[model samples]
Target: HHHHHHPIEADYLVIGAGIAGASTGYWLSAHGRVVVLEREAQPGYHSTGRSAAHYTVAYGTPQVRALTAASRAFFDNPPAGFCEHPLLSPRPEMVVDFSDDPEELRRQYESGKALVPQMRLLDAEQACSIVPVLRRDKVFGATYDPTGADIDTDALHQGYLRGIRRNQGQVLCNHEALEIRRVDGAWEVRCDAGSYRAAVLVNAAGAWCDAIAGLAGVRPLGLQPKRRSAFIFAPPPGIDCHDWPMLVSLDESFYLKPDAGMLLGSPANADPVEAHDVQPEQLDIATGMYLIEEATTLTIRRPEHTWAGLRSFVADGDLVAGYAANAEGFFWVAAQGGYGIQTSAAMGEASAALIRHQPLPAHLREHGLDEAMLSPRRLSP
Candidate 1:
């Protein structure tokens, strides 16, 4: 069934109803009339729904680390009713280093510490005390960050949607944009349902961001989608898994987190692929199981469930947020990679500020996100 509303227009029309778009619209709704267009029948049906749902500020690049740092305040003390359950729970993160290369171990420690200042290098005995299942003989040293926590992914996603709706913003699901054309110096977007007009267009289309640009005859930003798979299984019986830190190999070959009574594992694989509904590859799952067995002494049984999500990255692995150079009234808000959920607060506010032609936020300015770094012009010829 086709759905249509009055041809009412807006100042900003955001594509992609995942965390990025919802958060962007949530903030932009305060500035002007904003409408969100989501391809799926419901929001967060893609990568946002598939996130690992952790809040480790000490992950990703310098910019990502900074964003996560800046977002801590909001997560710690949410604004009024932004969330119900504590947005974050105390769940530590541990990186085990067992390779023969000492230099690699040092590099891992340094990199991990650069983002998480509280990170400490632990000896094999110390690591074993924290994670008893770890094979002591195979462990050399490890880095531990006690500040890591699991984020309530569904709550966070719904919070943005609720905020946007409460602020009178509109959301159109199953509205896929098929064409974009310049009309009266603005944008006329043709979606699967119908056409709509907007003074500015925000591209938060995730893996389809570059394709959205092409539809408008705008130059692509060289976005690439990388696949990551995860699965859940019950751990061995008679183990006090509570307070067990989510563990990852220093090389990022695999990681596991506590999920209810079961444990969730991922190979940390990053295979380049086209944008689509990703599924778990049997080989990848087998490799993940092998890695988990090798890293820890846990006897793997059958997996309860498995799935995959795409982490789209730009050429520089940093998020793009600003006006497009080639297309008038076009804005870029893509390339969130795996940091979207943690960085949503700052990223959304920054994108909204840029869309409203306001001065950049203090946090963004401190991070050295100058006009050049945030502008989509750099991606243009």
Candidate 2:
């Protein structure tokens, strides 16, 4: 027997409609009934929307690399009808060392061989030859990974959202999960706009993940949100930068690349922040200009636009993507940091497989991703 008003019901209730939740539902919706809820009026209103996303396995922690490496195939060759345009465009990336820790450049080149075997080491001259902006006296050495590419992050995110709908899943925006409780052996999620009851509850709320868990009566994982700012500016007077490769540093220095007929740069700052719709702070903007100006001859008159986002991280900084130890039926998929875009494909499949009691794909094992590594228990509380 059922009541006339039982609110909504689903097999799985996924919190947050960002890429994490969107991709997770995309994988599982075809396998089971799913409902994704977003607090904002639309998805990608926070971190995902703020990112100037790119794909490079050389970035992120070791576990992140495993996940990212597993995703290469998906970005290179997405499923049929996944998107009308290509997801990845070839754009090599460079890690340069100006004066700080020049030895770190070779360390990356050596350890990076397993994944990016084509990566090459270059002296200051060779590095500058690749991107004429480098000051001869500043840069000492660098490593170049030819296979790195730019990701059409927004399109991929929307495609996954569409996939969920395509597979009979529901995505409801402006449905903020205000309270979560256990009712009759199932998880009951009450939101501002509606309510839902499901066998499994997934917390993929990005910066708000911990808040969701606390509301659900689960232990908080002490996630930290960091501010990251980026801006786009004209490429210094008629210097068409369409072909310039993306440049970055290993010492939390900066990241720069050409975008939409302009050059985009970031201070790569990890300043702690509260979860919210963020904007670039003036101090960070000043820091960015100083760094970029020192590295290249390109003058920074002004940026055409600027934006900021939060990059959340757990205590140990590895991702948490499995069922919580104490909270029954609650799944955690948070702390993706900056690698969410690069690792979304495999992580989606991995989370879905876990929820469905299936084994991890062999390809992931080859890249070193296993249940134990990505399990929430492994992440320190």
Candidate 3:
């Protein structure tokens, strides 16, 4: 545990230069000096880079929904000079039920309406008009959230990085944290590039969260990484899909949305895998196209592009954030699953508050998104 002296030092050492680390660094730097390290030459070379950017309120658990609502303002009204362009744009979300399950549509409608009062309940005709590609005969009913929008994920991620840099926080790239040991009430992090010591350590290392925790001698929280594969294909002839709302199944079996000149599709697969540079399974690609074609008249032909990314999750499928019960100065900010991009800001604020030992924000309390809901103890032994 003895590094004797660190070549680099900061009051806070944050691992992972993805959205989680960048956003947390943006806020944590306000309190003290901060240093962020990433393993890749470029930040967000994994999950954060490949995620489909959307801000849907009804996609996660009740607590996650509450937190999504709490984070709405930050996306709508980011700080001046944060990004060159708007962080969010017009893009409604339409969930179509192909199984003819009225009760399923009702559940989704009830949940979505409770969160977004302006949400619309669409019958087959209404759903088709919103997303013309859908086969009206295949779907029974749908729930539409007009407020759902396409997030400018890169802009948001870069904004946080810019904010951190502006606040004098340093982000080191190509620096993988190989070992971490607790030393003299401070944490010593030895990375490939160099070594650093900090009074506080924030674990935001996506798929590597548990591995890092184990290296630091903290109990693993059963964190798992799941591979989500997606592809982009050209639209069928004469089908103008420029402004169509993104179409998804009520049960999340598959989805098709407009992207670039083509449409993006996914099987909504979450196959578990160990932390690594994941590749899309050929079976998943075939399955995704089959599901999409079954729900619509569109022909896949061939994929114009394809890729895969990992989304880490805890056993309960809830995000883990806060201090480790068994380790001093180690913070938990992993297991975000598919909601990391949408909830990064609020997560950052909450993580910072937890590390600084302050009360939760009043607006968050009003929404019932207390820190204890995302506490590591809920997932830890």
Candidate 1 structure lDDT: 0.85
Q: How accurate locally is residue 5 in candidate 2, as Cα lDDT from 0 to 100?
A: 47
For residue 332, model 1's alpha carbon misses the true position, in angstroms, by 1.1
Please state every model's RMSD to the true fold in angstroms: 2.1, 2.2, 2.0
Worst 10 residues of 1 by lDDT: 367-376
Per-residue lDDT for 20-44 in model 2, tens only? 9998899999988999989899898
In candidate 2, which residue ranges exceed 4 Å CA deviation? 1-6
Q: Report the C-alpha lDDT of model 3 over 1-381, residue by residue, as the tens digit.
A: 444443687899999999889888887987889999899999989899988888888888887787778888888898888888988888889999888899989988988898899998889998887777777789898999999888999999989888888888998898899999887778999986568889899998999999999889888888899999999999988999978887889888998888867899999999999999998889989999999888888998999889999988887878777998968899988988999998888888888888898878887788887778979887644
lDDT against the true structure, per candidate, is: 0.85, 0.87, 0.87
Instruction: Give lDDT tens digits, candidate 1, residues 1-381.
Output: 678655658899999999899889988987788889888999888999998898877678777777777777777887897878778888888888867556777776788787678888888899899999988888888888889888888888888888888889889898898888888767888886578889899999988999999898888889999999999998888976867898888788999889877899999998999999899899888999998898789988889999999999987777788888756788988889989999888788888988898887886677655556667676555
Ranking by lDDT: 2, 3, 1
Q: Is candidate 1 or candidate 3 better by lDDT?
A: 3
Off by over 4 Å in 1: 1-6, 367-369, 378-381
Compute the lDDT for candidate 2: 0.87
Give lDDT for model 3: 0.87
Candidate 3 Cα errors over 4 Å, as ranges: 1-6
| Residue 147 displacement (Å), model 3 | 0.6
